[PDB]
Amino acid sequence: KKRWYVVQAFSGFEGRVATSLREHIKLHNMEDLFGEVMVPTEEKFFPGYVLVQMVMNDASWHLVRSVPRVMGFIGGTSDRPAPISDKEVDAIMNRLQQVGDKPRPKTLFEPGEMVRVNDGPFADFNGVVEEVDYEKSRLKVSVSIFGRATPVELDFSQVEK
Amino acid sequence: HARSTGSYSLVTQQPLGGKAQFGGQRFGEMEVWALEAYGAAYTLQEMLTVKSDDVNGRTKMYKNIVDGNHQMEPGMPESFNVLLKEIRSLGINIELED
Amino acid sequence: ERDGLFCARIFGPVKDYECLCGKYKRLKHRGVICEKCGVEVTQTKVRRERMGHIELASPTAHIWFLKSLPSRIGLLLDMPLRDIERVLYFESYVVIEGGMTNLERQQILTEEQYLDALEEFGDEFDAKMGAEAIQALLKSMDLEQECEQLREELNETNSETKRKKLTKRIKLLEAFVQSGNKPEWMILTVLPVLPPDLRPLVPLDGGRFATSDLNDLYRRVINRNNRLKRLLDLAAPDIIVRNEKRMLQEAVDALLDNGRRGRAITGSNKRPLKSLADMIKGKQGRFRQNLLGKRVDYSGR
Amino acid sequence: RIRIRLKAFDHRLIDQATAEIVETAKRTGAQVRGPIPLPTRKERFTVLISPHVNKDARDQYEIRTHLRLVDIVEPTEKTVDALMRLDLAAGVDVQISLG
Amino acid sequence: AKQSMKAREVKRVALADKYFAKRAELKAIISDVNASDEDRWNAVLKLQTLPRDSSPSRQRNRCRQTGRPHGFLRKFGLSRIKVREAAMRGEIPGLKKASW
Ligand SMILES: [Zn+2]
User: Fold this and answer.
1) Best label site of A141, C294, D14, E1, fewest CB within 10 Å?
2) Is cis: bond before D54, omega within 30 of 0?
3) Using CA of residue C175, residue C177, residue C179, residue C180, what is the dihedral sign?
4) Contacts of B37 by beta carbon, 8 Å cutoff, 6+ apart
5) Does D have 3 or more CB contacts under 8 Å with B?
6) Would residue B7 be called left, alpha or beta, if left means φ above 0 and alpha means ψ between -120 and 50 degrees?
7) Helix residue spans in E1-100 (DSSP H)
């Protein structure tokens, strides 16, 4: 039985840490002591932590800490580092996309009249949105242009609440 | 080198240092001790409030000198307000009573 | 940045009597704040006196009251410095009014001590850790009650060493009651930020900004605090938020007095960066360099 | 591409506005599409001009709403943002739309 | 028109503003072919119960200056007579005498 553990890497080199970890496994051929390696990603939590299905021998512990650009495990102590849980894995299995679901297929940011456009033509700008076309994913934000609140069809992702 | 009134530093409103930067000579700590050692009290007050730090004090001083007045409105050093903001930016609550 | 460290609405307009973005270019309506600008309308030196506050997600105890030798929280909660730091850096648990169990109030707990206790005293039992637990301890510390006890303890003993150890603890216990200082004010909950004007961002001769060290410190505390708020939104597991709150604790402790904790942080290149307490202390602080000795106009050499 | 719909009652004013917009575009960015005149809306109205009765007595008014379609092919950093500053003549409803 | 008439109109408008959500809902219910008969009946009865002035088909468009019911224009909110005056004065933007 292989239980999960948390590894800390230099944040930013995480995919390269995951690749080097798989390669160190297939070098030192402790293939029966490693199951997977997770870096989850949303359309990126967790910011700098690598999840490893593993068992705990001191040889495999030295293996994971001899993988380059890895600081160490995160647990209660450094003698016997800590696995995480299992009761919160059943609820996480039913839902694995809480920060990008179809629960609210419309408003991604409170409309009202306070928003800023940056991914559209007029970048680094803010305006008041009277009406909105959520159905067709459109916004009528009236930006201040030539001393006038002129509206402009902007994208939900293009603007920022 | 000589300086009547030149540029002023940004974080603490005191004159700049050096010659290439048109600056004023450092009235250091031992000179403050040597003026405490006499009875010179107004000389030290204008030497570290009017001539150096207090911005409204030194504009009042410049108007008073070019009008013949010869008088100082003291005020507070602005760098002491910087000390209050740096101690206050910790968890410490420094104030000014009364 | 709206609204970042160097904000408009939180502090003031860069230009004197001007909305930085665009309205009021004369001297009539000094104060109006349109929605397009989210900016106040006052003087250029108004930002030097105005200060901001960072809502620290996780409580962080002050380093000046935890490592002053003797620590302010060390001789007040009757706990050794070593044990205080252990719990503070998410390496030890602390009990707080457990209940009907066989455990003290000051006595700490380890992973093994908690695990067994967790399966034992699953009901009425409280054993937190970090500044949060520490705060509670201080918060729930009847000052007056301790006075009499300490005073009675000093009059019911003859131990020389103990006498001096008891007189130094009761002195700081009755002094806190004499003033309006609370025991829960030791832990920082609403970290204050120094005025931008006092942490100036000027470019040198060229096209880049030579940034101060305090902007690195505040920007790291805010980066970590945003990460910790997002993880408490997402319900990350225990070890993730313990490392996250521990990194926030070390970030706050590095902002206030850098290097009093283990080896000081550094930006460029290996030299440590200068914190607030290092703007106060030393030969080049504010006392010895700008308040006792000043540079002086009408002077020559 | 940024489509811009200028609408106004006075034609001269509209023209002036359009030119200004073009100028604003052309200095910052490059390849302004051009000021394309769409059809004018001549919304007419008839009314009886007597207070009481005389039905053949009538005034026929109209409001000529003019349209100008200006398009900008390359939205740069500098160009799109510029619009905010350059203020045009009053009584000209503009309507910018990126994409 | 009288003051009284104007007041009445205003009241009607207010009522309309108030009761729109409910009334609309009721109407929808009544329409909905995929619904119970009893429910429909209730809805119909419910509608009756609501005030009459709550209906939008009750309120007459009057001139915003004079309250004259007839000769109205929607674009201007004014009766013909007043509209003409406005036009003459320059008070309606864009409006001028048309010939073709
Ligand atoms: Zn403004």
Assistant:
1) E1
2) no
3) positive
4) none
5) no
6) beta
7) 3-18, 20-31, 37-49, 80-89
CATH class, D1-99 region = alpha beta
- CA end-to-end distance (rounded Å), chain A: 46
Domain boundaries, chain D: 1-99
**Interface mutation vs chain A, best among C92, C224, C238, C239, most A CBs within 10 Å:** C239
Q: What are the extents of the domains in chain E?
A: 1-90
Nearest to A71 by CA among A6, A9, A4: A9
The CA-based angle C45-C50-C54, given to 5 degrees, is: 145
Helix (H, G, I), strand (E, B) or coil at C46: coil
After what residue numbers is chain A broken, C–N > 2.5 angstroms? 43
A57: left (phi over 0), alpha (psi -120 to 50) or beta: beta
Q: Who contacts C300 (Cβ-Cβ below 8 Å, separation ≥6)?
A: B1, B2, B3, B25
| CA distance linking residue A82 with residue C37, whole number of Å | 50
Interatomic CA distance for residues C63 and A51, integer angstroms: 33
Interface of A with D (CB under 8 A): 120-125, 143-148, 150-154
Interface subset of B 67-96, CB within 8 angstroms of C: 77, 79-83, 85-91
Cβ of residue D93 closer than 8 Å to a chain E Cβ: no
Which among A122, A148, A152 has the least Cβ separation from residue D81? A122
CA of C40 to the centre of ligand 1 (A): 8
Which tokens is C173 given?
């216990």
A5 lies in which domain range? 1-98
Exposed e or buried b per residue across A95-132, where buried means at least 16 C-beta atoms within 10 angstroms of its C-beta:
eeeeeeeeeeeeebeebeeebbbeebbbeebbbbbeeb
Take residue D79 and report the two structure tokens written for it: 């160009």
Report the amino acid identity of residue E14. Answer: A
Q: How many angstroms away from the CA of A102 is the closest CA of chain D? A: 25
Chain B, 13 to 72: residues with Cβ < 8 Å from chain C are: 14-17, 23-29, 31-32, 47-48, 51-53, 58
Domain with A16 in it: what CATH number?
A: 3.30.70.940
Torsion of CA D10, D11, D17, D20, to 10 degrees: -150
| First-last CA distance in chain C | 44
In angstroms, this model's resolution equals 3.1
Measure C36 CA to ligand 1 centroid, in angstroms: 7
**Nearest chain A residue (CA) to C243:** A74
* Chains in touch with E (≥3 Cβ pairs < 8 A): D
Q: Strand A159-160: give its sheet, edge to edge.
A: A149-154, A138-144, A125-133, A115-117, A159-160
Q: Are A7 and A50 in contact (CB under 8 A)?
A: yes
**Six token digits for residue B93:** 């609550």
- Return phi, psi of residue C147, to 5°: -50, -60
Q: How far apart are the first and last CA of chain E?
A: 36
Sign of CA dihedral C104, C105, C107, C113: positive
**Neighbouring C-beta atoms of residue B11, cutoff 10 Å:** 16
A145 contact partners, CB below 8 Å, separation of at least 6: A122, D83, D84, D86, D94, D96
B72: Cα within 13 Å, side-chain hemisphere: 18
Chain A contact for D19, CB < 8 A?
Answer: no
Q: Are chains C and B touching, using the cut-off of 8 Å on CB pairs and a minimum of 3 such pairs?
A: yes
Residue among D44, D48, D49 minimizing CB distance to E98: D44
Chains A and D touch (3+ CB pairs under 8 A): yes
**Which residues of D fall within a CB distance of 8 Å from E99?**
60
Q: Which of the other chains make 3 or more beta carbon contacts under 8 angstroms with chain C? A: A, B
Q: How many CB pairs under 8 A join B and C?
A: 119
